[PDB]
């Protein structure tokens, strides 16, 4: 097929500074940083992911770098560059509000119907881009959707992309290990359910092994209290046995966009209209020198 002409940018360790730790798990550690290129008079807020040094782990992080550098879309997280230190590290765009899952849980009392429906459009938009690029995500969840600003979200975590989370997986993905663009549609359905429930855990209490039988019996995730039958019908359509019967991401963009025009007709939230989330309208919305700071989305070299 088509040659992948993507540019892999190698960055100097001296060009960036680690400020604080954002998340440290089994993978290694993710830091909040600032990237000050050569003499460009700019400060780019970054997220640096560093890994001991084992040849097996280094191969895995370089494959994630391959996928991340191959994508480019307003609703998909891109790799800015890599630094070849003794350990090796990925330089990514800082998403100050973290993952959408923690965001909906922590801000439920101020998340209105407009935001929820706009996020659905945005996720479908990124997922439709991944489809056009012939790339299957294989791990779409509210935990893998990051928040740049409350009004702008992007899809991330390409550790399993390709050109186990059972409770987000499609039927063919569990029983036959079949991963298609339509199997990501099932994962999108669970993602939307997570949002509409304000970060509630899918199939809570139920073990992962029983899921296979439950889905074959016809049991699916319940209707969230805020959901009208209009929004729930879409979630249900994402969970059909026949993958071709499930909606396409371009249809999902259209469907949620129609709903985003009159959000109170499709999502019933007590306190809607009087709710508000941070925005560039806020006084001091944006530690050391914040003079010379620009986002990665605006910093582009020819
Ligand atoms: C709490 C928090 N604050 C963040 C700010 N900015 C990013 N930036 C980005 C940009 C692109 N991708 C990513 N992800 C890539 C995959 C990783 S990992 C280390 O789990 O592989 C998680 C974040 N983060 C990630 C952030 N986090 C994550 C640890 C969830």
């Amino acid at each position: 097929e088509a040659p992948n002409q993507a540019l892999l940018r190698i960055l100097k360790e001296t060009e960036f500074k680690k400020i604080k730790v954002l998340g440290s798990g089994a993978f290694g550690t993710v830091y909040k940083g600032l990237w000050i290129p050569e003499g460009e008079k700019v400060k780019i807020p970054v997220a640096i992911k560093e890994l001991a040094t084992s040849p097996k782990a280094n191969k895995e992080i370089l494959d994630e770098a391959y996928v991340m550098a191959s994508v480019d879309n307003p609703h998909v997280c891109r790799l800015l560059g890599i630094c070849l230190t003794s350990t090796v590290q990925l330089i990514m765009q800082l998403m100050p509000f973290g993952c959408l899952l923690d965001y909906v849980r922590e801000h439920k009392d101020n998340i209105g119907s407009q935001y929820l429906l706009n996020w659905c459009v945005q996720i479908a938009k990124g997922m439709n881009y991944l489809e056009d690029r012939r790339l299957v995500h294989r791990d779409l969840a509210a935990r893998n959707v990051l928040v740049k600003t409350p009004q702008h979200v992007k899809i991330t975590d390409f550790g399993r992309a390709k050109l186990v989370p059972i409770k987000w997986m499609a039927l063919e993905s569990i029983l036959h290990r079949i991963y298609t663009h339509q199997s990501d549609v099932w994962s999108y359905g669970v993602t939307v359910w997570e949002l509409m429930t304000f970060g509630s855990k899918p199939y809570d209490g139920i073990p992962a092994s029983e899921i296979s039988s439950i889905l074959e019996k016809g049991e699916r995730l319940p209707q969230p209290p805020i959901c009208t039958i209009d929004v729930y019908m879409i979630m249900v359509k994402c969970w059909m046995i026949d993958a071709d019967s499930r909606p396409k991401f371009r249809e999902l963009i259209i469907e949620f966009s129609k709903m985003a025009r009159d959000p109170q007709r499709y999502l019933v939230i007590q306190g809607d209209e009087r709710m508000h989330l941070p925005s560039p309208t806020d006084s001091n919305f944006y530690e050391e020198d914040m003079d010379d700071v620009v986002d990665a989305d605006e910093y582009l070299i020819p």
Side-chain angles (χ1 to χ4, degrees):
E1 66 149 54
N4 187 348
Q5 303 207 79
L7 296 168
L8 182 80
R9 203 173 188 177
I10 310 298
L11 308 173
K12 295 161 87 175
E13 187 184 41
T14 59
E15 279 191 304
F16 56 87
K17 280 93 189 73
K18 292 175 198 73
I19 296 144
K20 70 181 280 285
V21 188
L22 293 164
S24 193
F27 53 91
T29 170
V30 171
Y31 303 89
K32 177 191 189 283
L34 267 173
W35 173 46
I36 313 101
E38 294 251 276
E40 284 274 311
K41 208 206 169 190
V42 293
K43 292 177 188 189
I44 302 110
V46 294
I48 313 139
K49 181 198 182 172
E50 73 168 7
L51 297 151
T53 319
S54 58
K56 296 173 274 176
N58 284 115
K59 202 212 91 73
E60 285 177 54
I61 200 136
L62 290 165
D63 290 321
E64 195 196 4
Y66 180 94
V67 185
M68 278 209 85
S70 297
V71 291
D72 181 28
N73 187 268
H75 302 298
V76 172
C77 285
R78 199 184 164 269
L79 182 91
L80 306 173
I82 60 154
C83 183
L84 292 155
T85 46
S86 53
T87 60
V88 63
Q89 48 208 8
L90 318 173
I91 293 97
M92 312 171 298
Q93 183 198 25
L94 187 77
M95 304 291 280
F97 300 87
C99 74
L100 197 46
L101 180 75
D102 282 3
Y103 195 85
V104 290
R105 285 174 179 173
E106 282 152 57
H107 300 90
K108 50 189 181 282
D109 300 293
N110 285 290
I111 294 156
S113 55
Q114 188 72 79
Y115 277 88
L116 284 162
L117 294 162
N118 286 341
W119 293 330
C120 290
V121 180
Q122 291 188 30
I123 296 150
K125 277 185 169 175
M127 282 289 141
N128 182 61
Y129 169 80
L130 297 183
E131 193 173 339
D132 290 350
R133 286 284 346 277
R134 292 174 72 178
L135 197 97
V136 177
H137 198 281
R138 291 180 61 231
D139 192 21
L140 174 65
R143 76 186 109 91
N144 293 324
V145 179
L146 299 170
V147 189
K148 185 197 176 183
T149 61
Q151 40 279 321
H152 191 184
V153 300
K154 301 179 187 198
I155 308 148
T156 196
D157 210 277
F158 303 105
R160 9 190 332 178
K162 293 179 179 179
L163 177 63
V164 288
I166 300 107
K167 289 173 174 184
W168 279 262
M169 273 155 66
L171 193 88
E172 343 83 76
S173 305
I174 305 154
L175 291 154
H176 292 104
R177 295 169 196 170
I178 298 167
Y179 297 90
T180 182
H181 294 289
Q182 292 302 96
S183 69
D184 280 324
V185 173
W186 185 297
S187 301
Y188 175 91
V190 191
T191 304
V192 171
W193 185 89
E194 288 181 279
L195 300 188
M196 302 306 173
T197 56
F198 299 97
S200 287
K201 301 174 183 184
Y203 318 98
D204 186 71
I206 300 104
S209 56
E210 280 184 55
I211 307 295
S212 187
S213 296
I214 275 148
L215 265 42
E216 285 176 291
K217 280 170 193 176
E219 193 183 320
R220 301 299 192 272
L221 296 160
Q223 189 176 339
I226 69 132
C227 279
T228 54
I229 189 169
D230 296 73
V231 179
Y232 187 56
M233 204 71 76
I234 282 146
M235 275 148 66
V236 161
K237 275 173 183 178
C238 288
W239 310 318
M240 298 286 266
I241 297 294
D242 186 63
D244 304 297
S245 280
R246 293 170 196 163
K248 309 289 172 288
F249 289 119
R250 58 89 69 190
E251 297 177 325
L252 292 161
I253 295 160
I254 294 156
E255 278 308 299
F256 285 100
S257 285
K258 281 180 180 175
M259 300 198 288
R261 290 191 147 233
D262 194 6
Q264 271 145 63
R265 190 187 174 172
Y266 303 98
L267 297 176
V268 191
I269 301 155
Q270 212 82 353
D272 220 358
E273 293 161 295
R274 283 179 177 184
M275 283 182 181
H276 218 304
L277 293 167
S279 294
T281 53
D282 290 20
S283 203
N284 301 297
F285 168 77
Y286 296 104
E287 44 270 4
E288 289 181 301
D289 301 293
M290 270 274 293
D291 289 89
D292 324 294
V293 58
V294 279
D295 192 86
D297 290 343
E298 287 78 48
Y299 185 73
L300 292 143
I301 66 115

